[PDB]
């Protein structure tokens, strides 16, 4: 039974950004809709990346063949050491070829994994579940890894925050809202943590309430009346 | 049941971009016309891209044939393994050579794919169906994979959004005062809250079968 001015704000915010460059093949969400973490939001055309993957896998296959063939000649030569039929320089040379082929195998495995992860990142996702806004990018757009502007922003809409203020002069714990000049939000909130924010110049106490928002009806950035029991 | 002003925006927009560099051989659309997704909008000169592909496929066949020879050798070794003492060495050699011939195949298939994928891109298309605007590029222009400016922009019209500003069946009044023949729907689902201001925004949706409605035109919605 004491009401204060309040602002709603998001519990979690994440920007949707590409980790790989290319062309946006498709947008998978409606703007302003509820989204789940890890779901494909945009598909970057994966054709060229799929290829780099198939290529790198083919360099691996050649390299493993080359390594296997050289490994077999090391074994042949090893069992002929000490006999009329081979020399230590010959074996040492076969050893060198093997090592050389093995290094190639090494580097090729690296190339495959690199190109595998680029392929996977062609489906662009959000780290959190929430309400996605407008898309800042049209379909068929050129996106670059590391570009300034985010493609979209998602805001976690369930547990919602409400920042509340009282003056120095003003001075289990229920909080509730009058949504917009009358009607009351049918959810009850509590204070999030045993902590405050105090203003330096003017003596002031800002509190934070946390409300469940399962019907996804509260939005952040809303001016709201808040009362505390 | 009164009035709340709105403006129409496109349901979908797509930029048309080349994913392969070369010369624009032909433009296949008239500017301002209605287009279908996946139809060739521009043809980039495919000559070199074709040559690579045909060439790559030639390699694959050769590689494939060599694998046939190596596989046949391994089969013989296998079949004689139930009857004769065969050197593990002569056998691991046959296997090792089959592995090698197969790897050349795996390599050659990817060269076909790489070439196939570029060739496909000589036909430039839009991912969505819609109204195409002016072309940003003339015929015979040099286009580059990854260039900044898009070749053209296409806007989906047939279902159109109407956005309205605030402080279920929905119907329209066009700029002239006449009413729109098919009416739309408003969802409490989709919203937007302009925090830079604290303003509300609802998105309405209307069929536009006759393409008469255009994006960016000032509208008068009813409820």
Swiss-Prot record, chain A:
UniProt topology in membrane: Lipid-anchor
UniProt keyword annotations, A-Z: Antibiotic resistance, Cell inner membrane, Cell membrane, Coiled coil, Lipoprotein, Membrane, Palmitate, Signal, Transport
Disruption phenotype: Cannot grow on efflux substrates novobiocin or fusidic acid.
MF GO annotations: alkane transmembrane transporter activity; bile acid transmembrane transporter activity; identical protein binding
Key word Acetylation present: no
UniProt feature coiled coil, ranges: 46-120
Gene Ontology biological process terms in this record: alkane transport; bile acid and bile salt transport; fatty acid transport; response to antibiotic; response to toxic substance; response to xenobiotic stimulus; xenobiotic detoxification by transmembrane export across the cell outer membrane; xenobiotic transport
GO cellular component entries: efflux pump complex; outer membrane-bounded periplasmic space; periplasmic side of plasma membrane; plasma membrane
Top-rank lineage group of the source organism: Bacteria
Compartments it resides in: Cell inner membrane
Family to which this protein belongs: Belongs to the membrane fusion protein (MFP) (TC 8.A.1) family.
Biological role: AcrA-AcrB-AcrZ-TolC is a drug efflux protein complex with broad substrate specificity that uses the proton motive force to export substrates. This subunit may act as an adapter protein that links AcrB and TolC stably together. It is elongated in shape, being long enough to span the periplasm.
Subunit structure of this chain's protein: Monomeric in solution. Homotrimeric; interacts independently with AcrB and TolC as well as AcrZ. Part of the AcrA-AcrB-TolC efflux pump. Complex assembly is independent of an efflux substrate and appears to be constitutive.
Name of the protein in its database record: Multidrug efflux pump subunit AcrA
Originating species: Escherichia coli (strain K12)
Taxonomic path: Bacteria, Pseudomonadati, Pseudomonadota, Gammaproteobacteria, Enterobacterales
Range of the intact protein held here: 53 to 298 of 397
From Swiss-Prot, chain B:
Record's subcellular location: Cell inner membrane
Primary localisation category: membrane
Phenotype on disruption: Cannot grow on efflux substrates novobiocin or fusidic acid.
Domain of life: Bacteria
GO MF terms, alphabetically ordered: alkane transmembrane transporter activity; bile acid transmembrane transporter activity; identical protein binding
One GO process term, biological-process aspect: alkane transport
Record key words, sorted: Antibiotic resistance, Cell inner membrane, Cell membrane, Coiled coil, Lipoprotein, Membrane, Palmitate, Signal, Transport
Record carries keyword Lipoprotein: yes
Topology with respect to the bilayer: Lipid-anchor
Sections of the chain in a coiled coil: 46-120
GO CC annotation: efflux pump complex; outer membrane-bounded periplasmic space; periplasmic side of plasma membrane; plasma membrane
Assigned protein family: Belongs to the membrane fusion protein (MFP) (TC 8.A.1) family.
Job of this protein: AcrA-AcrB-AcrZ-TolC is a drug efflux protein complex with broad substrate specificity that uses the proton motive force to export substrates. This subunit may act as an adapter protein that links AcrB and TolC stably together. It is elongated in shape, being long enough to span the periplasm.
Assembly behavior: Monomeric in solution. Homotrimeric; interacts independently with AcrB and TolC as well as AcrZ. Part of the AcrA-AcrB-TolC efflux pump. Complex assembly is independent of an efflux substrate and appears to be constitutive.
Protein name as it appears in the record: Multidrug efflux pump subunit AcrA
Interval of the full protein contained in this chain: 53 to 297 of 397
